[PDB]
Amino acid sequence: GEVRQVSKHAFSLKQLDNPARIPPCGWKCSKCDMRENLWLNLTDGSILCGRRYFDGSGGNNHAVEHYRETGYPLAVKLGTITPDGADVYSYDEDDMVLDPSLAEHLSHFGIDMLK
Ligand SMILES: O=C(O)Cn1cnc2ccccc2c1=O
Ligand SMILES: [Zn+2]
């Protein structure tokens, strides 16, 4: 249904050591020129573009391809982070999800969502 459910990955999510400081703006896909529709993988801090949909809309699928290679399931859409939350997608559950540990997961990358 329409309500975002808690991801089964949220509580125990692996976040790798020595993460990048993710800035508040100005990101690019590390695999192509895209500067919109960018997804920050919460395990490794990769910044990669959103899915190509079957109507031909969306990005160049770099975030989904990175999931296929790593299994790192949660990503947050850059530009959606506010004091009230963010757009979090689970590749494993194939749904938009709630991450009750979002503030801690973003703090890992030096992101203050409350700012
Ligand atoms: O685009 C991405 O790489 C992550 N993402 C984000 N939002 C979605 C919403 C519906 C269906 C698929 C997706 C999806 O794959
Ligand atoms: Zn890309």
Side-chain angles (χ1 to χ4, degrees), residues 10 70 95:
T70 64
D95 265 315

Coordinates of all heavy atoms in Angstrom, one line a residue, residues 10 70 95:
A10 N 16.9 -1.1 7.9 CA 17.2 0.3 8.5 C 18.0 0.1 9.8 O 19.0 0.8 10.0 CB 15.9 1.0 8.6
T70 N 26.9 -4.5 -5.6 CA 27.3 -4.4 -4.1 C 26.2 -5.1 -3.2 O 26.6 -5.4 -2.1 CB 27.5 -2.9 -3.7 OG1 26.2 -2.2 -3.8 CG2 28.5 -2.2 -4.5
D95 N 10.9 -0.7 -3.1 CA 9.8 0.2 -2.6 C 10.5 1.4 -1.9 O 11.6 1.3 -1.4 CB 8.9 -0.5 -1.5 CG 7.6 -1.1 -2.1 OD1 7.0 -0.4 -3.0 OD2 7.4 -2.2 -1.7

